[PDB]
Amino acid sequence: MVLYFIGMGLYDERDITVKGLEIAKKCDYVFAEFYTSLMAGTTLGRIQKLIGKEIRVLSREDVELNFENIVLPLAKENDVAFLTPGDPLVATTHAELRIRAKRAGVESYVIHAPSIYSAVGITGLHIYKFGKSATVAYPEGNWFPTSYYDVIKENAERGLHTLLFLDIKAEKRMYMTANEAMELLLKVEDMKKGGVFTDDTLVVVLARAGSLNPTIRAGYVKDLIREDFGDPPHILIVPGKLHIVEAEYLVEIAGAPREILRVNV
Amino acid sequence: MVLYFIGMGLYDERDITVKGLEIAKKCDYVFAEFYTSLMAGTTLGRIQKLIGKEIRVLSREDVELNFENIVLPLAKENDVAFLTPGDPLVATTHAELRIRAKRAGVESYVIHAPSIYSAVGITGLHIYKFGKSATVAYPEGNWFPTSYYDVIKENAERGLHTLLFLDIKAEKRMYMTANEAMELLLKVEDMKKGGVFTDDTLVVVLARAGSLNPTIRAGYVKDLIREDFGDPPHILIVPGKLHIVEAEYLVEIAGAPREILRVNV
Ligand SMILES: Nc1ncnc2c1ncn2[C@@H]1O[C@H](CSCC[C@H](N)C(=O)O)[C@@H](O)[C@H]1O
Ligand code: NA
């Protein structure tokens, strides 16, 4: 009787750690969700094939309202695994599920996997220089989210980089592109006018991290806002003050304008 | 003609991803470094047996000063793998290595793995609330660095959490414990008296992340400063003001005192 929170990683079924795979293979029941992120390089079939078990996919409602009714009951008499994209506890509310497990007398263990949060390292930006992170959320009806704009501003004043997770509506199959995130940010800039995000702002786009050929691009909003970065998932990053080697990397690897090599100390 | 930056993960040889293991097995030559960090839950022998290849260890100088003379030459006519603890390119200087590859006409791909940057999510603290990160260094001689103290201050001031890496002497295999980190910070507080780190400061300790039995403890400095958190590596976190949900996880999972439910929320 035990519950394992196992991350499947960034892009495909092979992004799971060996630890996670060997443990999953031996579990009596295997559950999973695919609404907290998008694994663009795999399918349930390949995952099931790899694990050798039938996987039951849970919806956000199943998890958020019925985890203790669907999963925990089985964990009391068996070994259960709950799979999620990337790392199970990063930018999700799955951590709270460990409390529910506890209160049900079920021991839980966490098996990490590569996460988008650390994969930003591939952009060449020093990961220790990232500040507070935020999520660019799709406006809905008359409600237009904007706090993420304030995060960029706060980080920028401190010279820190800003990681922007992009919205996702799995059931509607909606995956926010970096382009849409940029459009929303310009609209918020027009609203607040803090000179935080404009056509001249340098940004970095990372798409489908985890694949052998992710899309890594850096440049000014005016030039990237309409560029095709390939299929989702995408994340947008607004760098703060750059170190020379960061700029060098963005130019050499992410095709940024050579002019950014000239940093303003 | 191809260099593969492959992450070994957090704690033991099984923290590498299935993708990383399979690719490593197809490489003609396999290099690894254990100076940016160490896999306390395994050995070079166990990693070699898992990969089924002989692994050549590289020192910090081998990499920083001679990467292009030791690794790249072979990558020109073979498939080569460069293994590192955690997720590749997280270590500040590693991304630049890809520029060296490009310059040498060598293709490079990144195979991600679990990083402490995302693994700390197991402490229950929301990942988006983490601010700038820092490393607590041992003072020595006339040198007493304290910038990490200022990082905590700026972060906590904005309600952000601070991830603190503890000093490590790879070659000498000596790790700074969370206990030593706390003592050091109290000492720094005594000199700067900014009211940033005191006996009443709430801290979180994460030890052996990646292991199936990690140590996750949360409490006030006065009660944790002499507690035994087990074997290294240790990571110290100074949380900013907590979301009730974070506080609850810390109490139920990290054994934190109920007092934080009213004092630090
Ligand atoms: N492989 C990938 N490439 C680019 N962005 C990704 C990504 N995986 C996740 N994301 C980003 O993060 C959002 C999901 S947030 C959940 C993250 C997950 N627990 C993890 O550990 O990665 C997506 O909407 C997207 O903006
Ligand atoms: Na961070």
Side-chain angles (χ1 to χ4, degrees), chain A residues 9-11 33 35-40 84-92 94 113-119 135 164-168 175-176 206-211 232-236, chain B residues 118:
Chain A
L10 303 166
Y11 187 65
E33 58 91 346
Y35 67 79
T36 53
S37 183
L38 174 66
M39 290 184 76
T84 72
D87 179 293
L89 312 184
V90 173
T92 73
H94 286 331
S115 171
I116 185 61
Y117 194 70
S118 75
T135 298
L164 298 173
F165 292 97
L166 303 193
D167 212 346
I168 175 180
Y175 308 106
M176 187 182 279
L206 172 57
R208 303 179 308 289
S211 68
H234 297 179
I235 55 152
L236 182 63
Chain B
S118 50

mmCIF file of all heavy atoms in Angstrom, chain A residues 9-11 33 35-40 84-92 94 113-119 135 164-168 175-176 206-211 232-236, chain B residues 118, ligand 1:
data_model
loop_
_atom_site.group_PDB
_atom_site.id
_atom_site.type_symbol
_atom_site.label_atom_id
_atom_site.label_comp_id
_atom_site.label_asym_id
_atom_site.label_seq_id
_atom_site.Cartn_x
_atom_site.Cartn_y
_atom_site.Cartn_z
ATOM 1 N N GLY A 9 8.246 13.782 -17.281
ATOM 2 C CA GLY A 9 9.190 14.620 -17.989
ATOM 3 C C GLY A 9 8.612 15.590 -19.000
ATOM 4 O O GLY A 9 7.397 15.701 -19.178
ATOM 5 N N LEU A 10 9.530 16.254 -19.697
ATOM 6 C CA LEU A 10 9.250 17.302 -20.671
ATOM 7 C C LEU A 10 8.509 17.080 -21.983
ATOM 8 O O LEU A 10 7.508 17.745 -22.246
ATOM 9 C CB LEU A 10 10.567 17.995 -21.028
ATOM 10 C CG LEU A 10 11.385 18.624 -19.907
ATOM 11 C CD1 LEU A 10 12.779 18.928 -20.419
ATOM 12 C CD2 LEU A 10 10.702 19.881 -19.413
ATOM 13 N N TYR A 11 9.008 16.169 -22.812
ATOM 14 C CA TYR A 11 8.447 15.971 -24.142
ATOM 15 C C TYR A 11 7.790 14.630 -24.485
ATOM 16 O O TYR A 11 6.644 14.603 -24.944
ATOM 17 C CB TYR A 11 9.557 16.286 -25.152
ATOM 18 C CG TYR A 11 9.146 16.307 -26.603
ATOM 19 C CD1 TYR A 11 8.254 17.267 -27.087
ATOM 20 C CD2 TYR A 11 9.687 15.392 -27.506
ATOM 21 C CE1 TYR A 11 7.916 17.315 -28.443
ATOM 22 C CE2 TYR A 11 9.357 15.431 -28.858
ATOM 23 C CZ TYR A 11 8.474 16.394 -29.318
ATOM 24 O OH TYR A 11 8.154 16.428 -30.657
ATOM 25 N N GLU A 33 -2.477 12.182 -15.458
ATOM 26 C CA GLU A 33 -3.203 13.362 -15.913
ATOM 27 C C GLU A 33 -2.354 14.027 -16.983
ATOM 28 O O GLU A 33 -1.123 13.929 -16.960
ATOM 29 C CB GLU A 33 -3.466 14.334 -14.753
ATOM 30 C CG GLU A 33 -2.223 14.838 -14.028
ATOM 31 C CD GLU A 33 -1.671 16.134 -14.601
ATOM 32 O OE1 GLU A 33 -2.075 16.529 -15.717
ATOM 33 O OE2 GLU A 33 -0.818 16.759 -13.931
ATOM 34 N N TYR A 35 -3.339 17.382 -18.130
ATOM 35 C CA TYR A 35 -3.945 18.697 -18.221
ATOM 36 C C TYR A 35 -3.063 19.807 -17.653
ATOM 37 O O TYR A 35 -3.285 20.979 -17.940
ATOM 38 C CB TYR A 35 -5.312 18.693 -17.525
ATOM 39 C CG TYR A 35 -5.265 18.503 -16.026
ATOM 40 C CD1 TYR A 35 -4.934 19.562 -15.177
ATOM 41 C CD2 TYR A 35 -5.557 17.263 -15.454
ATOM 42 C CE1 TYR A 35 -4.900 19.394 -13.797
ATOM 43 C CE2 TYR A 35 -5.522 17.081 -14.076
ATOM 44 C CZ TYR A 35 -5.194 18.150 -13.253
ATOM 45 O OH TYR A 35 -5.160 17.973 -11.891
ATOM 46 N N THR A 36 -2.051 19.448 -16.868
ATOM 47 C CA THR A 36 -1.175 20.461 -16.290
ATOM 48 C C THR A 36 -0.104 20.917 -17.276
ATOM 49 O O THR A 36 0.539 21.943 -17.076
ATOM 50 C CB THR A 36 -0.494 19.963 -14.989
ATOM 51 O OG1 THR A 36 0.168 18.715 -15.231
ATOM 52 C CG2 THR A 36 -1.517 19.783 -13.895
ATOM 53 N N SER A 37 0.093 20.152 -18.342
ATOM 54 C CA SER A 37 1.072 20.521 -19.353
ATOM 55 C C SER A 37 0.835 19.700 -20.602
ATOM 56 O O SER A 37 -0.067 18.872 -20.642
ATOM 57 C CB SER A 37 2.499 20.289 -18.854
ATOM 58 O OG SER A 37 3.441 20.729 -19.828
ATOM 59 N N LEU A 38 1.650 19.931 -21.621
ATOM 60 C CA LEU A 38 1.515 19.199 -22.865
ATOM 61 C C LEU A 38 2.800 18.468 -23.232
ATOM 62 O O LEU A 38 3.868 19.076 -23.339
ATOM 63 C CB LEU A 38 1.125 20.156 -23.996
ATOM 64 C CG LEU A 38 1.072 19.591 -25.420
ATOM 65 C CD1 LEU A 38 -0.047 18.563 -25.537
ATOM 66 C CD2 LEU A 38 0.847 20.728 -26.406
ATOM 67 N N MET A 39 2.697 17.156 -23.398
ATOM 68 C CA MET A 39 3.840 16.354 -23.809
ATOM 69 C C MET A 39 3.629 16.141 -25.306
ATOM 70 O O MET A 39 2.979 15.190 -25.732
ATOM 71 C CB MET A 39 3.865 15.029 -23.046
ATOM 72 C CG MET A 39 4.207 15.206 -21.572
ATOM 73 S SD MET A 39 4.354 13.655 -20.667
ATOM 74 C CE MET A 39 5.948 13.104 -21.229
ATOM 75 N N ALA A 40 4.181 17.062 -26.091
ATOM 76 C CA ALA A 40 4.036 17.063 -27.544
ATOM 77 C C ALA A 40 4.696 15.939 -28.329
ATOM 78 O O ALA A 40 4.415 15.775 -29.515
ATOM 79 C CB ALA A 40 4.508 18.406 -28.098
ATOM 80 N N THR A 84 2.390 12.456 -14.139
ATOM 81 C CA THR A 84 2.091 13.811 -14.604
ATOM 82 C C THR A 84 3.205 14.311 -15.517
ATOM 83 O O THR A 84 4.336 13.824 -15.465
ATOM 84 C CB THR A 84 1.978 14.835 -13.445
ATOM 85 O OG1 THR A 84 3.283 15.096 -12.917
ATOM 86 C CG2 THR A 84 1.071 14.319 -12.337
ATOM 87 N N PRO A 85 2.901 15.294 -16.374
ATOM 88 C CA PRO A 85 3.947 15.809 -17.260
ATOM 89 C C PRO A 85 5.031 16.464 -16.394
ATOM 90 O O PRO A 85 4.789 16.762 -15.222
ATOM 91 C CB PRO A 85 3.204 16.831 -18.112
ATOM 92 C CG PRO A 85 1.789 16.323 -18.119
ATOM 93 C CD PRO A 85 1.591 15.885 -16.693
ATOM 94 N N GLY A 86 6.213 16.685 -16.971
ATOM 95 C CA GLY A 86 7.309 17.308 -16.244
ATOM 96 C C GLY A 86 7.486 16.760 -14.843
ATOM 97 O O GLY A 86 7.432 15.549 -14.637
ATOM 98 N N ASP A 87 7.723 17.648 -13.880
ATOM 99 C CA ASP A 87 7.866 17.243 -12.488
ATOM 100 C C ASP A 87 6.484 17.453 -11.886
ATOM 101 O O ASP A 87 5.903 18.528 -12.013
ATOM 102 C CB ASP A 87 8.899 18.108 -11.767
ATOM 103 C CG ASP A 87 9.057 17.725 -10.310
ATOM 104 O OD1 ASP A 87 8.100 17.928 -9.532
ATOM 105 O OD2 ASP A 87 10.140 17.220 -9.941
ATOM 106 N N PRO A 88 5.944 16.429 -11.211
ATOM 107 C CA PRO A 88 4.615 16.484 -10.595
ATOM 108 C C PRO A 88 4.270 17.630 -9.644
ATOM 109 O O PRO A 88 3.093 17.970 -9.495
ATOM 110 C CB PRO A 88 4.488 15.112 -9.927
ATOM 111 C CG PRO A 88 5.893 14.754 -9.618
ATOM 112 C CD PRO A 88 6.635 15.179 -10.850
ATOM 113 N N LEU A 89 5.273 18.239 -9.020
ATOM 114 C CA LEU A 89 5.005 19.317 -8.068
ATOM 115 C C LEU A 89 5.390 20.718 -8.533
ATOM 116 O O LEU A 89 5.324 21.669 -7.753
ATOM 117 C CB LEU A 89 5.721 19.018 -6.749
ATOM 118 C CG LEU A 89 5.538 17.601 -6.197
ATOM 119 C CD1 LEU A 89 6.215 17.495 -4.847
ATOM 120 C CD2 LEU A 89 4.055 17.277 -6.073
ATOM 121 N N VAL A 90 5.786 20.852 -9.792
ATOM 122 C CA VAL A 90 6.198 22.153 -10.311
ATOM 123 C C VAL A 90 5.081 22.860 -11.071
ATOM 124 O O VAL A 90 4.614 22.374 -12.096
ATOM 125 C CB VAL A 90 7.432 22.005 -11.235
ATOM 126 C CG1 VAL A 90 7.758 23.327 -11.901
ATOM 127 C CG2 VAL A 90 8.620 21.527 -10.422
ATOM 128 N N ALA A 91 4.661 24.010 -10.555
ATOM 129 C CA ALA A 91 3.609 24.803 -11.184
ATOM 130 C C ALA A 91 2.302 24.028 -11.332
ATOM 131 O O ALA A 91 1.633 24.104 -12.359
ATOM 132 C CB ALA A 91 4.075 25.311 -12.548
ATOM 133 N N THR A 92 1.968 23.260 -10.306
ATOM 134 C CA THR A 92 0.718 22.548 -10.172
ATOM 135 C C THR A 92 0.268 22.652 -8.730
ATOM 136 O O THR A 92 0.917 23.246 -7.883
ATOM 137 C CB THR A 92 0.939 21.068 -10.553
ATOM 138 O OG1 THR A 92 1.682 20.418 -9.511
ATOM 139 C CG2 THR A 92 1.715 20.951 -11.869
ATOM 140 N N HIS A 94 -0.524 19.773 -7.163
ATOM 141 C CA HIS A 94 -0.473 18.358 -6.800
ATOM 142 C C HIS A 94 0.157 18.141 -5.419
ATOM 143 O O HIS A 94 -0.024 17.113 -4.780
ATOM 144 C CB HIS A 94 0.340 17.623 -7.866
ATOM 145 C CG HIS A 94 -0.476 17.504 -9.128
ATOM 146 N ND1 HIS A 94 -1.831 17.451 -9.137
ATOM 147 C CD2 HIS A 94 -0.019 17.430 -10.448
ATOM 148 C CE1 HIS A 94 -2.180 17.349 -10.434
ATOM 149 N NE2 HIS A 94 -1.117 17.334 -11.241
ATOM 150 N N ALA A 113 11.313 14.296 -12.276
ATOM 151 C CA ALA A 113 11.581 14.128 -13.695
ATOM 152 C C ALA A 113 12.004 15.497 -14.211
ATOM 153 O O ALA A 113 11.816 16.507 -13.528
ATOM 154 C CB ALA A 113 10.333 13.651 -14.420
ATOM 155 N N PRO A 114 12.593 15.557 -15.414
ATOM 156 C CA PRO A 114 12.995 16.879 -15.899
ATOM 157 C C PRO A 114 11.809 17.840 -16.005
ATOM 158 O O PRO A 114 10.732 17.474 -16.480
ATOM 159 C CB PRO A 114 13.659 16.573 -17.243
ATOM 160 C CG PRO A 114 13.042 15.262 -17.655
ATOM 161 C CD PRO A 114 12.959 14.499 -16.369
ATOM 162 N N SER A 115 12.024 19.071 -15.554
ATOM 163 C CA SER A 115 10.987 20.094 -15.552
ATOM 164 C C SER A 115 11.330 21.292 -16.433
ATOM 165 O O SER A 115 12.502 21.588 -16.669
ATOM 166 C CB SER A 115 10.754 20.569 -14.114
ATOM 167 O OG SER A 115 9.908 21.704 -14.067
ATOM 168 N N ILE A 116 10.303 21.983 -16.918
ATOM 169 C CA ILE A 116 10.528 23.157 -17.751
ATOM 170 C C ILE A 116 11.272 24.202 -16.915
ATOM 171 O O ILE A 116 12.115 24.933 -17.426
ATOM 172 C CB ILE A 116 9.186 23.770 -18.266
ATOM 173 C CG1 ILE A 116 9.470 24.933 -19.227
ATOM 174 C CG2 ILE A 116 8.351 24.282 -17.098
ATOM 175 C CD1 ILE A 116 10.251 24.533 -20.471
ATOM 176 N N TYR A 117 10.978 24.237 -15.616
ATOM 177 C CA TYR A 117 11.593 25.203 -14.711
ATOM 178 C C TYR A 117 13.131 25.177 -14.735
ATOM 179 O O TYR A 117 13.772 26.223 -14.606
ATOM 180 C CB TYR A 117 11.086 24.981 -13.279
ATOM 181 C CG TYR A 117 11.396 26.128 -12.336
ATOM 182 C CD1 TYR A 117 10.747 27.361 -12.462
ATOM 183 C CD2 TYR A 117 12.359 25.989 -11.334
ATOM 184 C CE1 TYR A 117 11.053 28.427 -11.612
ATOM 185 C CE2 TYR A 117 12.674 27.042 -10.481
ATOM 186 C CZ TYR A 117 12.022 28.259 -10.625
ATOM 187 O OH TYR A 117 12.375 29.304 -9.806
ATOM 188 N N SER A 118 13.729 23.997 -14.895
ATOM 189 C CA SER A 118 15.190 23.923 -14.937
ATOM 190 C C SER A 118 15.682 23.837 -16.380
ATOM 191 O O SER A 118 16.812 24.200 -16.683
ATOM 192 C CB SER A 118 15.704 22.717 -14.138
ATOM 193 O OG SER A 118 15.486 21.499 -14.828
ATOM 194 N N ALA A 119 14.831 23.358 -17.273
ATOM 195 C CA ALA A 119 15.216 23.275 -18.672
ATOM 196 C C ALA A 119 15.482 24.648 -19.308
ATOM 197 O O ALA A 119 16.013 24.758 -20.407
ATOM 198 C CB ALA A 119 14.108 22.545 -19.428
ATOM 199 N N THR A 135 2.401 33.218 -14.637
ATOM 200 C CA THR A 135 1.662 32.536 -15.685
ATOM 201 C C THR A 135 0.844 33.546 -16.487
ATOM 202 O O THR A 135 0.119 34.358 -15.910
ATOM 203 C CB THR A 135 0.708 31.480 -15.088
ATOM 204 O OG1 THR A 135 1.473 30.488 -14.394
ATOM 205 C CG2 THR A 135 -0.109 30.800 -16.192
ATOM 206 N N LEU A 164 7.935 32.912 -17.783
ATOM 207 C CA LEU A 164 6.492 32.990 -17.937
ATOM 208 C C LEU A 164 5.923 31.675 -18.444
ATOM 209 O O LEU A 164 6.141 31.293 -19.596
ATOM 210 C CB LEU A 164 6.109 34.108 -18.913
ATOM 211 C CG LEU A 164 6.480 35.549 -18.540
ATOM 212 C CD1 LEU A 164 6.172 36.478 -19.714
ATOM 213 C CD2 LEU A 164 5.715 35.974 -17.310
ATOM 214 N N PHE A 165 5.222 30.968 -17.569
ATOM 215 C CA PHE A 165 4.571 29.730 -17.963
ATOM 216 C C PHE A 165 3.407 30.236 -18.808
ATOM 217 O O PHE A 165 2.863 31.306 -18.527
ATOM 218 C CB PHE A 165 4.014 28.994 -16.742
ATOM 219 C CG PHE A 165 5.067 28.451 -15.816
ATOM 220 C CD1 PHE A 165 5.453 29.167 -14.687
ATOM 221 C CD2 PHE A 165 5.646 27.209 -16.051
ATOM 222 C CE1 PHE A 165 6.398 28.651 -13.800
ATOM 223 C CE2 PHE A 165 6.591 26.686 -15.169
ATOM 224 C CZ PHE A 165 6.965 27.408 -14.043
ATOM 225 N N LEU A 166 3.027 29.494 -19.840
ATOM 226 C CA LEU A 166 1.910 29.918 -20.682
ATOM 227 C C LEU A 166 0.662 29.089 -20.377
ATOM 228 O O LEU A 166 0.749 27.902 -20.063
ATOM 229 C CB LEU A 166 2.297 29.818 -22.160
ATOM 230 C CG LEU A 166 3.555 30.628 -22.514
ATOM 231 C CD1 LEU A 166 3.683 30.741 -24.029
ATOM 232 C CD2 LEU A 166 3.470 32.031 -21.887
ATOM 233 N N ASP A 167 -0.497 29.730 -20.468
ATOM 234 C CA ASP A 167 -1.769 29.085 -20.170
ATOM 235 C C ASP A 167 -2.050 27.830 -20.995
ATOM 236 O O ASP A 167 -1.483 27.624 -22.077
ATOM 237 C CB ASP A 167 -2.916 30.078 -20.365
ATOM 238 C CG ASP A 167 -4.079 29.821 -19.420
ATOM 239 O OD1 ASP A 167 -4.126 28.740 -18.801
ATOM 240 O OD2 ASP A 167 -4.951 30.701 -19.300
ATOM 241 N N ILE A 168 -2.944 26.999 -20.471
ATOM 242 C CA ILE A 168 -3.333 25.769 -21.135
ATOM 243 C C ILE A 168 -4.745 25.355 -20.731
ATOM 244 O O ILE A 168 -5.093 25.380 -19.554
ATOM 245 C CB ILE A 168 -2.351 24.625 -20.796
ATOM 246 C CG1 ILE A 168 -2.841 23.312 -21.410
ATOM 247 C CG2 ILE A 168 -2.197 24.502 -19.284
ATOM 248 C CD1 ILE A 168 -1.939 22.130 -21.123
ATOM 249 N N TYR A 175 -3.521 25.623 -26.273
ATOM 250 C CA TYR A 175 -2.167 25.760 -25.747
ATOM 251 C C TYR A 175 -1.614 27.116 -26.174
ATOM 252 O O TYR A 175 -1.300 27.331 -27.341
ATOM 253 C CB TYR A 175 -1.294 24.627 -26.284
ATOM 254 C CG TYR A 175 -1.909 23.264 -26.054
ATOM 255 C CD1 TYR A 175 -2.469 22.541 -27.111
ATOM 256 C CD2 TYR A 175 -1.982 22.718 -24.770
ATOM 257 C CE1 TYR A 175 -3.091 21.307 -26.892
ATOM 258 C CE2 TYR A 175 -2.599 21.485 -24.542
ATOM 259 C CZ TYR A 175 -3.152 20.789 -25.605
ATOM 260 O OH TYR A 175 -3.770 19.578 -25.378
ATOM 261 N N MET A 176 -1.508 28.032 -25.219
ATOM 262 C CA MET A 176 -1.019 29.372 -25.503
ATOM 263 C C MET A 176 0.382 29.392 -26.108
ATOM 264 O O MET A 176 1.322 28.796 -25.574
ATOM 265 C CB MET A 176 -1.035 30.220 -24.231
ATOM 266 C CG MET A 176 -0.706 31.684 -24.468
ATOM 267 S SD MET A 176 -0.676 32.627 -22.938
ATOM 268 C CE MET A 176 -2.430 32.921 -22.685
ATOM 269 N N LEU A 206 11.264 29.443 -25.855
ATOM 270 C CA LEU A 206 11.705 28.061 -25.789
ATOM 271 C C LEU A 206 10.464 27.229 -26.066
ATOM 272 O O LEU A 206 9.466 27.324 -25.344
ATOM 273 C CB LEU A 206 12.255 27.730 -24.397
ATOM 274 C CG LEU A 206 12.582 26.248 -24.150
ATOM 275 C CD1 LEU A 206 13.576 25.751 -25.196
ATOM 276 C CD2 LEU A 206 13.149 26.073 -22.744
ATOM 277 N N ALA A 207 10.523 26.420 -27.117
ATOM 278 C CA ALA A 207 9.388 25.592 -27.495
ATOM 279 C C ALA A 207 9.748 24.121 -27.547
ATOM 280 O O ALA A 207 10.793 23.746 -28.073
ATOM 281 C CB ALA A 207 8.850 26.040 -28.853
ATOM 282 N N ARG A 208 8.870 23.297 -26.994
ATOM 283 C CA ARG A 208 9.060 21.859 -26.984
ATOM 284 C C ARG A 208 10.399 21.426 -26.392
ATOM 285 O O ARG A 208 11.133 20.649 -26.998
ATOM 286 C CB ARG A 208 8.913 21.305 -28.408
ATOM 287 C CG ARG A 208 7.578 21.633 -29.073
ATOM 288 C CD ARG A 208 7.528 21.075 -30.495
ATOM 289 N NE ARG A 208 8.702 21.505 -31.244
ATOM 290 C CZ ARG A 208 8.912 22.748 -31.663
ATOM 291 N NH1 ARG A 208 8.016 23.693 -31.420
ATOM 292 N NH2 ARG A 208 10.035 23.050 -32.302
ATOM 293 N N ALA A 209 10.717 21.939 -25.206
ATOM 294 C CA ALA A 209 11.948 21.562 -24.531
ATOM 295 C C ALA A 209 11.811 20.063 -24.270
ATOM 296 O O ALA A 209 10.712 19.569 -24.011
ATOM 297 C CB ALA A 209 12.078 22.323 -23.210
ATOM 298 N N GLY A 210 12.918 19.335 -24.346
ATOM 299 C CA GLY A 210 12.849 17.902 -24.122
ATOM 300 C C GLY A 210 12.977 17.140 -25.423
ATOM 301 O O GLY A 210 13.410 15.990 -25.439
ATOM 302 N N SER A 211 12.574 17.762 -26.523
ATOM 303 C CA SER A 211 12.758 17.116 -27.802
ATOM 304 C C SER A 211 14.212 17.284 -28.176
ATOM 305 O O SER A 211 14.931 18.051 -27.553
ATOM 306 C CB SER A 211 11.848 17.787 -28.834
ATOM 307 O OG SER A 211 12.288 19.112 -29.103
ATOM 308 N N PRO A 232 3.168 23.819 -29.775
ATOM 309 C CA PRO A 232 3.313 24.052 -28.335
ATOM 310 C C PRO A 232 3.858 22.763 -27.732
ATOM 311 O O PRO A 232 3.959 21.753 -28.421
ATOM 312 C CB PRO A 232 1.883 24.350 -27.889
ATOM 313 C CG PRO A 232 1.063 23.517 -28.837
ATOM 314 C CD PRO A 232 1.745 23.770 -30.160
ATOM 315 N N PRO A 233 4.221 22.775 -26.442
ATOM 316 C CA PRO A 233 4.159 23.902 -25.509
ATOM 317 C C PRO A 233 5.285 24.915 -25.680
ATOM 318 O O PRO A 233 6.380 24.581 -26.142
ATOM 319 C CB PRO A 233 4.207 23.216 -24.152
ATOM 320 C CG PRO A 233 5.132 22.061 -24.416
ATOM 321 C CD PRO A 233 4.643 21.541 -25.749
ATOM 322 N N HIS A 234 4.996 26.158 -25.312
ATOM 323 C CA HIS A 234 5.965 27.240 -25.386
ATOM 324 C C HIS A 234 6.033 27.906 -24.023
ATOM 325 O O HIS A 234 5.093 27.825 -23.230
ATOM 326 C CB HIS A 234 5.525 28.342 -26.366
ATOM 327 C CG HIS A 234 5.402 27.908 -27.794
ATOM 328 N ND1 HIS A 234 4.991 28.771 -28.790
ATOM 329 C CD2 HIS A 234 5.650 26.724 -28.402
ATOM 330 C CE1 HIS A 234 4.994 28.137 -29.948
ATOM 331 N NE2 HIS A 234 5.389 26.893 -29.741
ATOM 332 N N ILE A 235 7.154 28.563 -23.753
ATOM 333 C CA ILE A 235 7.304 29.350 -22.538
ATOM 334 C C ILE A 235 7.931 30.625 -23.046
ATOM 335 O O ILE A 235 8.657 30.609 -24.041
ATOM 336 C CB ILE A 235 8.262 28.748 -21.483
ATOM 337 C CG1 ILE A 235 9.634 28.480 -22.092
ATOM 338 C CG2 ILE A 235 7.657 27.516 -20.876
ATOM 339 C CD1 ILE A 235 10.747 28.542 -21.069
ATOM 340 N N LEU A 236 7.632 31.733 -22.389
ATOM 341 C CA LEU A 236 8.206 33.002 -22.783
ATOM 342 C C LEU A 236 9.092 33.475 -21.636
ATOM 343 O O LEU A 236 8.767 33.274 -20.464
ATOM 344 C CB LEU A 236 7.098 34.025 -23.056
ATOM 345 C CG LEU A 236 7.542 35.415 -23.527
ATOM 346 C CD1 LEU A 236 8.244 35.320 -24.876
ATOM 347 C CD2 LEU A 236 6.327 36.320 -23.625
ATOM 348 N N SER B 118 14.000 22.348 -9.508
ATOM 349 C CA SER B 118 12.601 21.949 -9.608
ATOM 350 C C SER B 118 12.241 20.943 -8.516
ATOM 351 O O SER B 118 11.098 20.902 -8.054
ATOM 352 C CB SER B 118 12.305 21.347 -10.990
ATOM 353 O OG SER B 118 13.254 20.356 -11.345
HETATM 354 N N1 LIG C 1 8.573 20.866 -22.878
HETATM 355 C C1 LIG C 1 8.139 22.118 -22.692
HETATM 356 N N2 LIG C 1 8.537 23.147 -23.518
HETATM 357 C C2 LIG C 1 8.118 24.435 -23.366
HETATM 358 N N3 LIG C 1 7.261 24.842 -22.371
HETATM 359 C C3 LIG C 1 6.862 23.823 -21.545
HETATM 360 C C4 LIG C 1 7.237 22.503 -21.638
HETATM 361 N N4 LIG C 1 6.623 21.744 -20.609
HETATM 362 C C5 LIG C 1 5.922 22.614 -19.947
HETATM 363 N N5 LIG C 1 5.987 23.914 -20.421
HETATM 364 C C6 LIG C 1 5.445 25.099 -20.043
HETATM 365 O O1 LIG C 1 4.840 25.007 -18.677
HETATM 366 C C7 LIG C 1 3.398 25.008 -18.746
HETATM 367 C C8 LIG C 1 2.884 23.842 -17.814
HETATM 368 S S1 LIG C 1 3.127 24.304 -16.142
HETATM 369 C C9 LIG C 1 3.369 22.653 -15.382
HETATM 370 C C10 LIG C 1 4.857 22.350 -15.448
HETATM 371 C C11 LIG C 1 5.340 20.969 -15.123
HETATM 372 N N6 LIG C 1 4.992 20.403 -13.763
HETATM 373 C C12 LIG C 1 6.916 20.869 -15.246
HETATM 374 O O2 LIG C 1 7.564 20.392 -14.288
HETATM 375 O O3 LIG C 1 7.437 21.296 -16.355
HETATM 376 C C13 LIG C 1 3.037 24.882 -20.185
HETATM 377 O O4 LIG C 1 1.784 25.504 -20.437
HETATM 378 C C14 LIG C 1 4.240 25.559 -20.872
HETATM 379 O O5 LIG C 1 4.088 26.979 -20.920
#
